[PDB]
Design a protein around this ligand. Structure first.
Ligand code: ZN
Ligand code: ZN
Length: 50
């Protein structure tokens, strides 16, 4: 998926977000500094400041 602040495809790393207002739902783990697959509803830094 082509969604991120740096705008790049999620090649092998795709973490999905839960945000009612969120076009950037898809991300890659390395951008958002993660290696753990989320155990539940993952709010991206954008949703966390909304
Ligand atoms: Zn990125
Ligand atoms: Zn979000």
């Amino acid at each position: 998926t082509l969604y991120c602040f740096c705008q790049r495809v999620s090649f092998g790393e795709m973490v999905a977000c839960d945000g009612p207002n969120c076009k950037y739902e898809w991300f890659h783990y390395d951008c958002v500094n993660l290696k753990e697959p989320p155990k539940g509803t993952w709010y991206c830094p954008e949703c966390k400041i909304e």
